[PDB]
Amino acid sequence: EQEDVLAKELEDVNKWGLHVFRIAELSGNRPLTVIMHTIFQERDLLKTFKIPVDTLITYLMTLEDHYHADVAYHNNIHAADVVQSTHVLLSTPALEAVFTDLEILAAIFASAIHDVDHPGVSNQFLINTNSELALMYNDSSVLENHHLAVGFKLLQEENCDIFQNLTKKQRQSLRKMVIDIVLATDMSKHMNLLADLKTMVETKKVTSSGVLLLDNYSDRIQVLQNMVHCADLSNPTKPLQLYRQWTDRIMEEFFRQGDRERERGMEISPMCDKHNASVEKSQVGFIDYIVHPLWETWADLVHPDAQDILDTLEDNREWYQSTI
Amino acid sequence: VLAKELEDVNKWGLHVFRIAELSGNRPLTVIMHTIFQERDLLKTFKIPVDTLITYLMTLEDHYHADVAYHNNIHAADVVQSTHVLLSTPALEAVFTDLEILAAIFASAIHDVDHPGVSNQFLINTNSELALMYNDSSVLENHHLAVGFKLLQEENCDIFQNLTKKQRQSLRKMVIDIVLATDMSKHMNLLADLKTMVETKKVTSSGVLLLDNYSDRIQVLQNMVHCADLSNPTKPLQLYRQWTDRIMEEFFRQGDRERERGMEISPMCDKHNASVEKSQVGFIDYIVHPLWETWADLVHPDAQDILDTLEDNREWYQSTIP
Numbered sequence: 001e002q003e004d005v006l007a008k009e010l011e012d013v014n015k016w017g018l019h020v021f022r023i024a025e026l027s028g029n030r031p032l033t034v035i036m037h038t039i040f041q042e043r044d045l046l047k048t049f050k051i052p053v054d055t056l057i058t059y060l061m062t063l064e065d066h067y068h069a070d071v072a073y074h075n076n077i078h079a080a081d082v083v084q085s086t087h088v089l090l091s092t093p094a095l096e097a098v099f100t101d102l103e104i105l106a107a108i109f110a111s112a113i114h115d116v117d118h119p120g121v122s123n124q125f126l127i128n129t130n131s132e133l134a135l136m137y138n139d140s141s142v143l144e145n146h147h148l149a150v151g152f153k154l155l156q157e158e159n160c161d162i163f164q165n166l167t168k169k170q171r172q173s174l175r176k177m178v179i180d181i182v183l184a185t186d187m188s189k190h191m192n193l194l195a196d197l198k199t200m201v202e203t204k205k206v207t208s209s210g211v212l213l214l215d216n217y218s219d220r221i222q223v224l225q226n227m228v229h230c231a232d233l234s235n236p237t238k239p240l241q242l243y244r245q246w247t248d249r250i251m252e253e254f255f256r257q258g259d260r261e262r263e264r265g266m267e268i269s270p271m272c273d274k275h276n277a278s279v280e281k282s283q284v285g286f287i288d289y290i291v292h293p294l295w296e297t298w299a300d301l302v303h304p305d306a307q308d309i310l311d312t313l314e315d316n317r318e319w320y321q322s323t324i
Numbered sequence: 325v326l327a328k329e330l331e332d333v334n335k336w337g338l339h340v341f342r343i344a345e346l347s348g349n350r351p352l353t354v355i356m357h358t359i360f361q362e363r364d365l366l367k368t369f370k371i372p373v374d375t376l377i378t379y380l381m382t383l384e385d386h387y388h389a390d391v392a393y394h395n396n397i398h399a400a401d402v403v404q405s406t407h408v409l410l411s412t413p414a415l416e417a418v419f420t421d422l423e424i425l426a427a428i429f430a431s432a433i434h435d436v437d438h439p440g441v442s443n444q445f446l447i448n449t450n451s452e453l454a455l456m457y458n459d460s461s462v463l464e465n466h467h468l469a470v471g472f473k474l475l476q477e478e479n480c481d482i483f484q485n486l487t488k489k490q491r492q493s494l495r496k497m498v499i500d501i502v503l504a505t506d507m508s509k510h511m512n513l514l515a516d517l518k519t520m521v522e523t524k525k526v527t528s529s530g531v532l533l534l535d536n537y538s539d540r541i542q543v544l545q546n547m548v549h550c551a552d553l554s555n556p557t558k559p560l561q562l563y564r565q566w567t568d569r570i571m572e573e574f575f576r577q578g579d580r581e582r583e584r585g586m587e588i589s590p591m592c593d594k595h596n597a598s599v600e601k602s603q604v605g606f607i608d609y610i611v612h613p614l615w616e617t618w619a620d621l622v623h624p625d626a627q628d629i630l631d632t633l634e635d636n637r638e639w640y641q642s643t644i645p
């Protein structure tokens with residue numbers, strides 16, 4: 001039976017390299033709903049926060065609807081992938097019992113909404129084309145502000161407030177953490193976020209059990225920011241058959257943006273020129289300048305928990321390099 | 325009959341409330357149309373005059389008339405005040421006609437569509453505004469968005485004949501200025517103004533020396549921040565009306581914060597407020613440290629302004645028995 005196979009694939013929810021694309025097929029193009037549902041059951045979040053199962057499904061279905069299914073990369077499959085990757089990074093041994101159930105809920109919820117209603121074009125495109133989104137948000141983290149606004153607003157639809165039984169202060173603390181995390185997914189913050197993570201690794205403090213010692217909001221939210229940031233940039237760390245399909249999708253989306261940029265007489269953004277692009281050189285540069293400096297720093301923070309993930313990234317980089 | 329009050333449009337202490345009544349409740353439209361014919365900005369940026377009027381009229385309409393303080397009069401006052409802190413001798417042709425243009429247009433839009441309540445109120449009440457802007461500079465983001473949005477209505481693009489890079493540069497500066505009017509950034513903004521003063525570099529003749537952009541934009545941020553917090557530096561009859569209007573607006577919020585069960589915001593409880601102690605605390609802890617630093621930066625220049633401030637503070641303290 002179809003849902004017998006889907007249920008078997010959901011046994012891998014705690015594993016890096018989950019067949020997220022097959023789960024999309026087997027779930028009827030609802031990877032975000034079923035992976036979020038599975039993760040919430042796995043972490044026992046429905047009982048902890050008194051989330052009615054029908055409210056959760058209704059919100060997750062409405063949230064998945066607002067991801068564009070005609071956008072090749074930034075869609076509900078990407079959201080489900082980031083949710084599940086964050087869920088795995090949360091289970092790393094070096095972070096056992098570090099985070100409260102509320103912080104875990106915030107990081108997973110942030111991963112679910114982090115790209116909702118993504119139109120398939122970059123912030124800079126939205127700025128340069130004087131979009132209504134750029135006009136609303138004053139050219140600052142335009143997409144990321146929009147993902148948050150949409151993600152929270154959908155909680156107000158009929159039977160959609162999954163946080164209805166959190167206390168006032170739990171509400172206020174979660175909303176702030178979700179905002180801080182999603183705003184950190186803006187790539188213009190990557191360099192400063194990585195520099196902060198480098199500083200933390202160099203001054204890393206650990207408890208008598210081997211668990212990372214987080215002392216204040218500034219350190220705890222910064223780790224959660226980089227965790228979701230790593231999950232957002234985790235495609236080159238996955239098994240190659242998954243990585244390659246992510247590369248096909250982002251190039252599909254980029255090339256579309258370049259066709260609109262050229263039609264408009266604009267300068268074509270890097271990697272968006274389908275007449276001058278090297279898919280393979282772009283992935284090597286993506287790994288060398290962005291993904292590997294980030295994941296190698298994260299692996300130091302949780303050493304040695306992320307050695308396999310770092311090994312896969314370096315193998316995949318070697319493979320893409322060899323195709324040139 | 326209004327035009328001779330407007331002859332004062334260059335002095336600290338413009339009788340802006342008079343101009344408001346003489347203009348038919350249009351102080352912003354007439355004070356901007358005067359400051360634009362005075363700095364000759366309609367030529368330099370080829371602004372057709374009917375287009376400028378059309379924008380200012382639509383801008384002024386989007387300030388709420390039933391809001392006691394954050395209305396068009398306060399906007400007209402901050403425009404005119406920035407306009408004079410722009411004619412200070414130490415800062416004279418250290419800003420482009422475009423940078424001048426940003427600081428004035430920013431002052432004009434810096435509170436547009438203000439509902440008369442604080443950011444913290446909008447956050448704590450799950451308002452549509454706070455939901456849109458993720459609890460960060462909720463009002464100021466909205467002031468900018470409305471101010472730019474109105475440029476796109478019929479015959480309102482007063483920046484139509486700027487070049488492409490000029491429009492991008494003006495937009496960036498206006499955004500940086502208005503976002504800096506958020507009071508939650510006051511302490512950071514003042515420490516940076518002190519730092520610029522601590523290792524200031526002047527010529528010796530008057531003018532101050534800024535080189536890059538991060539410090540030239542900080543000056544107009546603090547400048548519009550000063551003009552925003554310039555009520556206690558104006559003559560006492562003007563200051564006292566501003567005090568009546570802000571406490572009126574605060575008391576309405578405090579009422580709506582009690583018909584809700586919220587913690588009453590500071591100075592908003594009409595049954596536990598000392599209007600006079602609040603003004604003295606406002607001066608001691610916010611207005612005077614800011615204007616001392618501005619007057620140091622522009623030494624002397626703003627000594628009449630700093631004098632009037634400490635006069636007004638002494639008087640308000642004398643109203644406390």
Ligand SMILES: COc1ccc(/C=C2/C(=O)Oc3cc(O)ccc32)cc1OC
Pocket residue numbers: 187235236243246247250271282283286290
């Ligand atoms: C699977 O490959 C990819 C997956 C995602 C992205 C997305 C990127 C994005 O949205 O903005 C970027 C900006 C940059 O400066 C570099 C990469 C990206 C880029 C990828 O490859 C280039």
Ligand SMILES: COc1ccc(/C=C2/C(=O)Oc3cc(O)ccc32)cc1OC
Pocket residue numbers: 507555556563566567570591602603606610
């Ligand atoms: C003329 O007096 C005033 C004029 C304006 C304001 C406005 C203020 C505002 O919007 O947020 C504030 C926060 C503070 O911590 C102190 C003052 C203000 C306050 C005034 O007096 C308190």
Ligand SMILES: [Mg+2]
Pocket residue numbers: 114115143185186
């Ligand atoms: Mg994103």
Ligand SMILES: [Mg+2]
Pocket residue numbers: 434435463505506
């Ligand atoms: Mg304001």
Ligand SMILES: [Zn+2]
Pocket residue numbers: 078082114115185232
């Ligand atoms: Zn993403």
Ligand SMILES: [Zn+2]
Pocket residue numbers: 398402434435505552
């Ligand atoms: Zn103001």
